[PDB]
Amino acid sequence: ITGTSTVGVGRGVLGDQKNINTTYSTYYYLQDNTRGDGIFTYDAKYRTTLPGSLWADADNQFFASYDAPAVDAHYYAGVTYDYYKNVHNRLSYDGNNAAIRSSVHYSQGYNNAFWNGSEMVYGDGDGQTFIPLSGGIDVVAHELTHAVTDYTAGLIYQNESGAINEAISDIFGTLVEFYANKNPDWEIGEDVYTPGISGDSLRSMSDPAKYGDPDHYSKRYTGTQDNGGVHINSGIINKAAYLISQGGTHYGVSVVGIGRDKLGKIFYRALTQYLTPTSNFSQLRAAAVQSATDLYGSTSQEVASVKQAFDAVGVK
Ligand SMILES: [Ca+2]
Ligand SMILES: [Ca+2]
Ligand SMILES: [Ca+2]
Ligand SMILES: [Ca+2]
Ligand SMILES: [Zn+2]
């Protein structure tokens, strides 16, 4: 759409009020011209046909309940863009300011969200297992991060490389949640999962076992479901990343924490410079050690912490 940049106001899935960047041309569209080549939010109208219609509103006020998921998908994609730009100096997912597109109200009672190789898609949930998925900043960042991976390491979505792909997305979605200071934690999807039960989440980085996921390589899923356990085995890596950041003793192995900022820096460098499509857990270990070496020196505490972390989870 060609028009005048303006700012509207709306309420998100959680009932929070926010300002969003809009474009005016007869109607007010969910098109943010201030970030790269734009952030565009579409209405999929309960259908599966993508992307759907660019979101149009008559008065620049997004307070209807049907508006909620679109407000959050559009605002949270802005925050994620900002995190990548400000923190890692990367312009959009491809590093060249590619337009970011999201579709909301996809299908009926769809309990998932995903990156389809070209755009983000968000279900509205069935109302009990989930509420609209765009209401979780970690979910939005998890998804956008799959775009980043796609354009850099290109990790195949299966087995070890796929679990690495999932872990990266969980790591960066959690860093974006801390970055926005939106009640941050080391859990995934807490804000949108089981609106009736308090205190739970989809996955835990601090304690993957809480939900049955492995926290050690010896406990790794060797089967066939979930593409060889891409969402299961990511727990071994998520735990390694939580220990590098925060520290702790795990299976008797002690890790001194180096904090979140360094964890983001070492992971981004491993991602963009050393990982390949078919990298396995042992290769991620070498890639992380080499990044921390590049950045802090071979004899740094940072490098020492990365080794301890992987030894704590049985990776190498
Ligand atoms: Ca309106
Ligand atoms: Ca949170
Ligand atoms: Ca979270
Ligand atoms: Ca819940
Ligand atoms: Zn994912």
Side-chain angles (χ1 to χ4, degrees):
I1 247 127
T2 292
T4 198
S5 301
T6 56
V7 176
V9 42
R11 197 130 58 209
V13 167
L14 277 64
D16 52 323
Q17 188 177 295
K18 45 197 56 142
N19 297 310
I20 46 202
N21 288 120
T22 61
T23 293
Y24 176 63
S25 200
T26 147
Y27 276 99
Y28 289 94
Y29 301 90
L30 289 183
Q31 171 188 144
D32 175 3
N33 307 120
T34 75
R35 299 172 158 105
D37 292 331
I39 299 174
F40 301 90
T41 302
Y42 295 81
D43 191 5
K45 313 183 205 210
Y46 311 133
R47 313 284 296 180
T48 57
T49 267
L50 290 169
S53 286
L54 184 61
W55 196 289
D57 186 82
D59 68 358
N60 221 19
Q61 302 206 87
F62 303 85
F63 296 101
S65 73
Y66 187 79
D67 298 343
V71 167
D72 285 341
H74 195 56
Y75 184 93
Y76 294 141
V79 174
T80 301
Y81 174 93
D82 290 354
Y83 163 83
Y84 280 100
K85 188 203 180 177
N86 300 330
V87 181
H88 300 286
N89 254 283
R90 183 184 185 81
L91 306 174
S92 195
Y93 62 81
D94 73 333
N96 232 302
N97 271 153
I100 292 167
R101 252 135 196 156
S102 304
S103 295
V104 302
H105 293 306
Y106 173 86
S107 195
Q108 296 194 23
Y110 192 67
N111 289 317
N112 219 327
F114 53 100
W115 166 257
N116 83 349
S118 55
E119 62 167 291
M120 275 166 301
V121 183
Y122 301 93
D124 287 316
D126 48 31
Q128 220 204 20
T129 314
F130 275 103
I131 61 180
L133 290 84
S134 62
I137 189 182
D138 48 6
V139 169
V140 172
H142 172 112
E143 294 321 332
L144 216 268
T145 301
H146 274 310
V148 178
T149 299
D150 277 357
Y151 280 90
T152 57
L155 297 153
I156 287 148
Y157 210 65
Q158 71 188 26
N159 307 324
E160 284 187 21
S161 71
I164 292 158
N165 193 325
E166 284 299 308
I168 296 295
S169 275
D170 280 348
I171 289 155
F172 286 109
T174 282
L175 296 167
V176 170
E177 189 171 307
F178 266 106
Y179 180 73
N181 212 61
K182 195 210 126 215
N183 245 47
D185 44 63
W186 289 92
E187 309 289 297
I188 311 294
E190 70 285 346
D191 283 337
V192 293
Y193 185 66
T194 63
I197 335 342
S198 263
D200 57 342
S201 70
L202 208 52
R203 285 189 284 288
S204 181
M205 304 178 68
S206 57
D207 190 17
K210 186 181 177 158
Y211 310 107
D213 299 326
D215 61 1
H216 192 283
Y217 199 64
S218 72
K219 297 179 176 198
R220 183 185 0 139
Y221 177 69
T222 50
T224 271
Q225 30 153 304
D226 188 28
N227 290 109
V230 131
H231 299 89
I232 301 162
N233 295 326
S234 51
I236 299 169
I237 310 308
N238 284 347
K239 185 71 190 192
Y242 168 80
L243 284 162
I244 294 169
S245 178
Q246 300 312 96
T249 293
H250 183 61
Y251 299 92
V253 178
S254 297
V255 193
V256 178
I258 66 172
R260 67 197 160 66
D261 250 59
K262 305 167 168 188
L263 171 69
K265 239 116 206 220
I266 290 158
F267 272 79
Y268 182 83
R269 177 167 247 273
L271 179 65
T272 56
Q273 300 304 339
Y274 304 113
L275 291 174
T276 77
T278 276
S279 281
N280 60 212
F281 283 17
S282 144
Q283 288 154 332
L284 170 68
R285 181 183 165 117
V289 172
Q290 178 70 242
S291 302
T293 288
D294 288 353
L295 300 166
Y296 306 113
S298 61
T299 63
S300 55
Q301 173 68 246
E302 289 87 0
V303 166
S305 283
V306 165
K307 288 156 160 169
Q308 284 133 41
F310 280 91
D311 282 344
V313 295
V315 183
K316 297 152 100 156

